[PDB]
């Protein structure tokens, strides 16, 4: 009759942490195969039956909206990494679930959670110090122009792809499109449009805005196409 909970579901101790560790691995499995350029795609269907195919880890987590409490922590952390950077959400999501998996058997053996936190806070700072000590600055290495090194980095992602035979042309289109912008660079600014048919090398790079122009109404031999 007189109980304390009366609907208030609550559990504490080691079983709660282990339950959150397993729930976090589910979010990892949802974005485990999408790591890298050649990662497997993921098909997502909304309520209306509309399909969504994408191998981007950030876009996948936005569409899931998992209701588990522990899973929301990773999603909000990964979402912040997307807003601040736009890349690395999968690495953050996988490493977090993997830090939790490796300390899982020690948590079951009676190791306190707070001792585990001192290790991550300690190992993290040592890792951040090792990155800066071993990292290398590359601005004018080998007296090569930046337009050439950036071409190598561009074709690297495009290597062994469907445009591998003509990636020299496509590699220059990336460096050209980025160099056209001002100091404030952003991915959304540089748009892309698709035109079926024709050779791969015929891909054009308009400096301004471009569109198909399906307008085929009357008006020819008038309406001068050039304006100052």
């Amino acid at each position: 009759v007189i109980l304390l909970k009366e609907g208030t579901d609550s559990s504490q101790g080691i079983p709660q942490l282990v339950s959150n560790i397993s729930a976090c691995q589910v979010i990892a499995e949802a974005v485990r195969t999408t790591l890298g350029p050649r990662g497997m795609d993921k098909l997502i269907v909304d309520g209306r039956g509309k399909a969504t195919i994408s191998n981007d880890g950030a876009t996948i987590l936005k569409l899931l909206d998992v209701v588990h409490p522990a899973a929301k922590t990773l999603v909000d952390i990964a979402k912040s990494q997307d807003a601040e950077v736009g890349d690395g959400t999968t690495s953050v999501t996988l490493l977090a679930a993997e830090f939790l998996k490796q300390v899982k058997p020690y948590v079951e053996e009676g190791l306190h959670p707070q001792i585990i936190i001192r290790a991550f806070r300690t190992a993290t700072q040592l890792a951040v110090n090792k990155i800066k000590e071993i990292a290398v600055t590359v601005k004018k290495a080998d007296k090569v122009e930046q337009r050439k090194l950036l071409e190598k980095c561009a074709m690297t992602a495009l290597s062994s792809k469907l445009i591998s035979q003509q990636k020299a042309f496509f590699a220059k289109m990336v460096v050209d499109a980025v160099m056209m912008l001002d100091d404030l660079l952003q991915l959304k600014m540089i748009g892309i449009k698709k035109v079926q048919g024709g050779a791969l090398e015929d891909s054009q790079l308009v400096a301004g805005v471009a569109f198909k122009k399906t307008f085929s109404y009357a008006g020819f031999e008038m309406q001068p196409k050039k304006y100052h």
Binding site: E6, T8, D9, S10, S11, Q12, Q16, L17, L35, G36, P37, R38, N55, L74, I77, Q81, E84, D87, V92, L94, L95, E98, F99, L100, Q102, Y106, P113, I115, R118, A119, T124, L126, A127, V128, I131, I134, V136, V138, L149, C153, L158, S160, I163, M173, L187, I190, G191, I192, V195, Q196, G197, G198, E201, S203, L205, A210, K212, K213, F215, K225
Partner: protein
């Protein structure tokens, strides 16, 4: 006419005008400007475009190919190619990608954990093995044998390797620094910090409370 709103709004930020629904308020406040405009013949169809706009912080890249999957697969890879070039100019300090930096930290933290007596030894070592997942899944997703690569990769770092990592193209290890597979060091630093800070929030939790509603 028949211009998509995205192309119109893309030209709005490029020209610096305003898309006014009704034609009654059309005036110099909403009207845009440009330096050179010309109608071309890309692939036979006409493509209008204003070049040298006042707020010309945007552009467009028209793709061509034998099908949509040639362009769609090309569309995905170029968007990251823009980010790679966008990243190298911003941050000059970089590290080897493909999990090369993750294996170096695994060597440093693991060798450091031995000199740390106490319960932090097993945990800092556990932190090191957790970094193996980044080069591991790149091998598993690429269809390679993670055992033969990770064992051959972890052995190279012990002999003196610092940039060797996973090569998604060839099923073998490669110097990702010499191969120009780079990533920003500060972006990778923020990944470990957000990872540990995210794991610490879950580890520091011991009980869940739920108001009955």
């Amino acid at each position: 006419g028949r211009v998509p709103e995205e192309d119109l709004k893309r030209t709005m930020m490029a020209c610096g005008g305003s898309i006014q629904t009704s034609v009654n308020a059309l005036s110099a406040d909403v009207l845009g400007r440009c330096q050179v405009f010309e109608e071309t013949q890309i692939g036979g169809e006409r493509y209008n475009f204003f070049t040298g706009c006042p707020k010309a912080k945007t552009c467009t890249f028209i793709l061509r190919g034998g099908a949509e999957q040639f362009m769609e697969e090309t569309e995905r890879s170029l968007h990251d190619a823009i980010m790679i070039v966008r990243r190298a100019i911003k941050n000059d300090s970089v590290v080897a990608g493909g999990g090369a930096i993750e294996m170096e930290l695994s060597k440093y933290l693991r060798d450091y954990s031995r000199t740390i007596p106490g319960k932090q030894q097993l945990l800092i070592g556990a932190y090191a093995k957790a970094l193996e997942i980044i080069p591991r899944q790149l091998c598993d997703n690429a269809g390679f044998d993670a055992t033969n690569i990770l064992n051959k990769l972890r052995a190279r770092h012990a002999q003196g390797g610092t940039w060797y990592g996973v090569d998604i193209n060839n099923e073998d290890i490669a110097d990702n620094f010499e191969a120009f597979v780079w990533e920003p060091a500060m972006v990778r630093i923020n990944a470990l910090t957000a990872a540990s800070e995210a794991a610490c929030l879950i580890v520091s939790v011991d009980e869940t409370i739920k108001n009955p509603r």
